[PDB]
Design a protein around this ligand. Structure first.
Ligand code: FAD
Ligand code: GGL
Length: 1219
């Protein structure tokens, strides 16, 4: 099959109307607003009449408004906010007891008289949904639950007020969850309760609350639920028709687990027939069937379903098909043009529900994460209001061919449209709509001859407690944010004049019409003045898909090559082809590999050229990196094609990798501009050995850092992926890196070994396996710099990454993050999820959902957008992974695998696999493939489990899914890993936002994409930006006092200076996208091995280690035991003496004192220690006397990155204030 010939063909050729939609997707806000203002303009007379009507409605709303039930309960029992939240959580839990008499007995006999804890909230915290009840009680969203505060509050309120307050809480929650948040628990109950307002002139559309199917079984459940509801609604409608009678609303995401543009062929083949069958049933009963609008990247896909349905002759004669359009979206007027034309062509009077939109804060976050040009929604609330009124004018001009349905709770919006529609009205011309239990106060001033005599359809949620709680936060934020009408009308500090303000005239009078909100960053400006964010590509945009298709095809027609590019020019060598891992018939290019002799020559040439590159000023070296970033951004589509075909990656992952390469270049450039001066001299020639799994990004990151720190580079790319490396070198050279400063040496591991062994090699940057890093460490321990000090090694070496999930996590969120973390990139990320740990009480349900989601993945050659998982890199990798799977299977462990299509046979594929283990110790080696292991744990054994995760010795990435603050605090304080992720996936660390790198068996540090990286690549490290701490280690202070008491005044002063200079305790938040908090902290590394030679050297080593929070093991062969007598117990607790260093590890670093040959000997003994590669610092006794910084404190602390998804509860609290 020709490369990319079937990458992403659209469902149908795009008409002129469809292209106008796509053209507006991310149109600048200043371009969108002027035509909306023009379309929304009304005469002065109408505006005065509309303001008068709006004032009348608002005066009625404020005149009949009473205090809510929850407020009256809080008042009656003098509850604090936390007590109110806790009470509603208890009431929710008591309502999970189905039998009434049993529940009432538990309240009277167990709950009221004392400890609620012994009787409820065991496997499941009482407070799982406290973020939701927090919104109900306080109006404020808090993303995680302080379950210790709520437990204290519940104990306090029960001990104070007893059974009467529990009774009132239960009755209140019963009413709210059975009658307010839903019209009824079941469609039959909802229908029964609908007759009252139908007799007053309201109508209904029932919302069955399903969305976001994760498995085929979920989708089938939502389908049969919609089918049964249509029968009930149609029986009840009893021939009333689509305007007077009730209808149903559906969400397409409920009806297929892979509802996305990437899976468009499956959507049209599998989802469409299901909608058609439901529509045929709605037709037979003559009821409305409305398609709800969801995320912006589903809008245009949903239009293809609407088109086919409206043109399908089997549905003719029925006008009940309906469709939502969101006015906060920039495409809205163009979507309406398309729908109105479709209604004309089909002869169907499409029911068009105009809404503002329910996903605003999620759309802001997604555009920022994806680095896109602009948002697909407005960023000022008043812009959405003008858009709404402009689109209403368009709909009101077309009431002969569509049925407009104006869904809004805003009385100003309502009044404007009521007067815009004019005097002639009949039922069927248009209607308003509102939400059950929210809009009735307003629309009881609208419906009926005694009011405005306009009808209103009530959108009526129907479902159980579990179903309604799933996305209730999103629903509450619709009317509960600071800019929301409903919130403002309940604000006594908001005047009626402010509420009837005309958005159209206010926008017109702004100095810059349509300006972006001042407090929302465009994705390109996420980092402000520090650096320019890389830009991505929108794979839901048909223009982008069409242009990418052509650029990818053109990339496959190119003759890609990689050569040994020495300072003197290209070199000759053995030449072989490079094959596509997904199809070995696809020759991607040719590589000429380096001889060991030319590798040694290249190091000599780099040493010769080192002074000339060091002499380029840091600002100009940084300018080279910035130029290279511009070139990679411009070349991204071609680079994507090469990464897809050479490395076996999906287009989605290739985009993210090119972004990361750009980000490394710009980040290390900025860090250079912040730090490097004449005193930060380069190490010398640096050997950069890069992996095949990130063959552009990690390749570029290591090289850019070394180059910009002033070092010439020997770049040794992975044997499997030389072509993208050669292209990266071409770009850096074009950007101004001299050929003598950057030499490319393709080949296997003996090229890397020859480079590492060369006498002029001054440092090594390695990313790859622990075994190979260990062999490199042994090579380097043979050598010293010309100054007689160890050759620095930065080695990043993988992990055995775990995710812990408790019973408070939302299963659908968990499963999405697990599927991504374990199987993205065929599990070939060092960050990938390897062990999922499920709390026993929820393990079976989550495992069922996970296996169902597994079988929805598409595996194949990655030149198709529909492929989720590509090949593994080689046949040897495939064989290694499959041997592990079969060993587990042979031991009797449950193995789940997806079936592979026959087309995979021409490449090297491993199917995504789930293996159920009894305990974590059952997994003994790192399996670098799409293989997820699952274990279960009892909640009381959580702390032991964290110990088990730490006990492996790895410490790279780690995930935690929980809503509970006590569990977050416990787990994050006890886990020892470099990159922590809370309520999100554990992959795709972002440069400068989640600096990446771990500890123990996972690496030496410093973190890539972090502020300590460049300092390792110069002889004297600079002070990184923001790198300081006001905290002083108390054991350091006790040691300094002990030194003073022994009379060692000089060393006591040096100890106090180390205490001040240490950055232990640094605690920063890094700028990033909204809806996420990204934290960066400095901790102690662990136990540092001290190898002293003199008394003063030992005191200096101890001061450095203690100032950075570490414990120490001191070499007993030093003979210096008598120098450390009578230590304070606080210091003694941190001090041990070691005769057998191998028995007393693992260590987290080392400090060595001695002459050059002593240092070399100790360096070899340290390399021989089993376990982690130690970051070793050495100094002579004279150097310790002369240089207070002989041992650099930068390398005695451990960096930790933590990324918290603060939108995980369903919305963004910070953005509730942005309008
Ligand atoms: C009957 C009915 C059916 C609905 N069905 C859907 C649906 O299928 N899909 C869907 O997405 N929504 C749907 N909604 C929700 C709806 O879109 C609104 O979120 C909600 O009703 C609030 O809008 P409002 O006009 O009633 O109030 P208003 O308070 O006047 O408006 C609030 C809205 O303003 C917008 N907004 C807030 N801040 C900003 C900002 N900084 N920049 C730009 N815009 C901003 C948001 O859209 C927000 O919801 C429906 C609402 C109703 C009444
Ligand atoms: N930085 C990558 C992993 C890099 C690697 O695999 O070595 C991530 O966070 O997904």
């Amino acid at each position: 099959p020709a490369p990319f010939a079937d990458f992403a063909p659209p469902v149908r050729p795009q008409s002129t109307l469809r292209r106008a939609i796509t053209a507006a997707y991310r149109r600048p806000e200043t371009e969108c607003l002027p035509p909306l203002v023009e379309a929304a303009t009304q005469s002065k007379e109408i505006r005065d009449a509309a303001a008068s009507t709006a004032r009348k409605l608002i005066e009625a709303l404020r005149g009949k408004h009473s205090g809510s039930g929850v407020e009256g309960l809080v008042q009656e029992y003098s509850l604090s906010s936390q007590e109110g939240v806790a009470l509603m959580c208890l009431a929710e839990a008591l309502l999970r007891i189905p039998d009434t008499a049993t529940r009432d007995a538990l309240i009277r006999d167990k709950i009221a008289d004392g400890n609620w804890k012994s009787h409820l909230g065991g496997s499941r915290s009482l407070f799982v949904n406290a973020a939701t009840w927090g919104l109900v009680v306080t109006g404020k969203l808090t993303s995680t639950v302080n379950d210790r505060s709520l437990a204290a509050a519940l104990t306090r309120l029960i001990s104070r007020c007893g059974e009467p307050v529990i009774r009132r809480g239960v009755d209140m929650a019963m009413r709210m969850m059975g009658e307010q948040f839903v019209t009824g628990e079941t469609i039959r109950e909802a229908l029964k309760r609908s007759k009252e307002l139908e007799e007053k002139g309201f109508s209904y559309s029932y919302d069955m609350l399903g969305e976001a199917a994760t498995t085929a079984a979920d989708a089938e459940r939502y389908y049969r639920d919609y089918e049964s509801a249509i029968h009930a609604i149609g029986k009840a409608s009893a021939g009333r028709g689509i305007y007077e009678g009730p209808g149903i609303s559906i969400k397409l995401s409920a009806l297929h687990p892979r509802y996305s543009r990437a899976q468009a062929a499956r959507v049209m083949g599998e989802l469409l027939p299901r909608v058609k069958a439901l529509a045929l049933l709605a037709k037979n009963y003559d009821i409305g069937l409305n398609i709800d609008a969801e995320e912006a990247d589903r809008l245009e896909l949903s239009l293809d379903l609407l088109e086919v349905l409206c043109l399908d002759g089997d549905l003719s004669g029925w006008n009940g098909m309906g469709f939502v359009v969101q006015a906060y979206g920039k495409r809205c007027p163009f979507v309406l043009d398309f729908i109105i034309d479709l209604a004309r062509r089909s002869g169907r009077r499409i029911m068009v529900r105009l809404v503002k939109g329910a996903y605003w804060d999620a759309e802001i976050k997604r555009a920022q994460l994806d680095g896109l040009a602009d948002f697909p929604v407005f960023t000022r609330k008043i812009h959405t209001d003008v858009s709404y009124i402009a689109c209403a004018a368009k709909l009101l001009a077309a009431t002969d061919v569509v049925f407009p349905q104006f869904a809004t709770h805003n009385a100003q919006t309502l009044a404007a449209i009521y007067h815009m529609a004019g005097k002639d009205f009949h039922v069927g011309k248009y209607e308003f709509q509102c939400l059950h239990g929210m809009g009735e106060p307003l629309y009881e001033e609208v419906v009926g001859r005694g009011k405005l005599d306009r009808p209103c359809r009530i959108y009526a949620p129907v479902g159980t407690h579990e179903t309604l709680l799933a996305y209730l936060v999103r629903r509450l934020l619709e009317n509960g944010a600071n800019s929301s009408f409903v919130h403002r009308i309940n604000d006594p500090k908001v005047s009626i004049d402010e509420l009837i303000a005309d958005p159209v005239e206010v926008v017109r009078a702004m100095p810059v019409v349509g300006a972006k909100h001042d407090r929302i960053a465009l994705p390109a400006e996420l980092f402000g003045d520090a650096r320019t964010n890389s830009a991505g590509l929108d794979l839901s945009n048909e223009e982008t898909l069409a242009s990418l298709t052509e650029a990818l095809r053109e990339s496959a027609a190119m003759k890609w090559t990689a050569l040994p590019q020495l300072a003197t020019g290209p070199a000759a060598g053995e030449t072989r082809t490079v094959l596509n891992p997904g199809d070995h018939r696809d020759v991607v290019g040719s590589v000429t590999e380096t001889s060991e002799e030319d590798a040694r020559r290249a190091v000599r040439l780099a040493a010769d050229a080192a002074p000339d590159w060091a002499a380029v000023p840091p600002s100009e070296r940084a300018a080279c990196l910035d130029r290279a970033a511009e070139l990679m951004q411009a070349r991204m589509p071609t680079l994507l094609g090469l990464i897809i075909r050479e490395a076996g990656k999906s287009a989605l992952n290739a985009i993210a990798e090119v972004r990361e390469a750009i980000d490394f270049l710009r980040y290390y450039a900025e860090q250079t501009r912040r730090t490097l001066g004449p005193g930060h001299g380069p190490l010398g020639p640096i050997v950069c050995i890069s992996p095949w799994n990130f063959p552009l990004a990690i390749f570029t990151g290591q090289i850019a850092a070394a180059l910009v720190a002033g070092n010439p580079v020997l770049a040794k790319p992975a044997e499997e992926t030389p072509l993208i490396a050669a292209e990266g070198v071409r770009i850096l050279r074009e950007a101004g890196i001299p050929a003598s400063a950057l030499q490319l040496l393709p080949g296997d591991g003996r090229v890397g070994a020859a480079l590492v062994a060369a006498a002029e090699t001054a440092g090594v940057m390695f990313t790859g396996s622990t075994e190979v890093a260990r062999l490199i460490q042994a090579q380097l321990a043979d050598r010293l710099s010309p100054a007689g000090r160890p050759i620095p090694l930065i080695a990043e070496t993988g992990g055995q990454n775990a995710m812990i999930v408790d019973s408070s996590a939302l299963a659908e969120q968990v499963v999405g993050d697990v599927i991504t973390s374990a199987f993205d990139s065929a599990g070939q990320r060092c960050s990938a999820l390897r062990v999922l740990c499920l709390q026993e009480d929820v393990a079976d349900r989550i495992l069922t959902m996970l296996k169902g989601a597994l079988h929805e993945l598409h595996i194949g050659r990655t030149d198709r957008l529909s492929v989720d998982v590509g090949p593994v890199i080689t046949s040897e990798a495939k064989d290694n992974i499959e041997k592990h799977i079969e060993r587990m299977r042979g031991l009797g462990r449950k193995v789940e695998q997806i079936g592979l299509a026959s087309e995979t046979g021409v490449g090297t594929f491993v199917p995504p696999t789930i293996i159920e283990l009894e305990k974590l110790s059952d997994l003994q080696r790192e399996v670098f493939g799409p293989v997820l292991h699952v274990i279960r744990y009892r909640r009381d054994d959580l702390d032991r489990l964290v110990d088990d995760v730490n006990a492996t010795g790895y410490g790279l990435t780690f995930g935690l899914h929980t809503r509970l603050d006590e569990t977050i605090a416990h787990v994050t304080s006890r886990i020892k890993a470099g990159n922590l992720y809370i309520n999100r996936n554990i992959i795709g660390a972002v440069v400068g936002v989640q600096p990446f790198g771990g500890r123990g068996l996972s690496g030496t540090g410093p973190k890539a994409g972090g502020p300590l990286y460049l300092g390792r690549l110069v002889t004297t490290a600079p002070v990184p930006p923001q790198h300081s701490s006001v905290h002083t280690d108390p054991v350091l202070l006790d040691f300094a006092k002990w030194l003073d008491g022994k009379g060692a005044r000089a060393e006591a002063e040096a100890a106090r200076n180390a205490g001040s200079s240490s950055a232990l305790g640094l605690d920063l938040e890094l700028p990033g996208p909204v809806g996420e908090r990204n934290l960066y902290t400095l901790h102690a590394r662990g136990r540092i091995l001290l190898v002293p030679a003199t008394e003063s050297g030992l005191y200096h080593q101890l001061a450095a280690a203690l100032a950075t929070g570490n414990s120490v093991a001191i070499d007993a062969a030093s003979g210096l035991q008598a120098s450390l007598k009578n230590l304070p117990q606080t210091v003694g607790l941190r001090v041990s003496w070691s005769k057998d260093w191998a028995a007393d590890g693992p260590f987290a670093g080392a400090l060595v004192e001695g002459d050059a040959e002593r240092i070399r000997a100790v360096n070899k003994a340290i390399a021989a220690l089993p376990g982690p590669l130690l970051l070793v610092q050495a100094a002579s006794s004279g150097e310790i006397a002369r240089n207070p910084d002989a041992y650099c404190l930068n390398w005695l602390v451990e960096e930790v990155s933590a990324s918290i998804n603060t939108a995980a509860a369903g919305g963004n609290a910070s953005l509730m204030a942005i309008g």
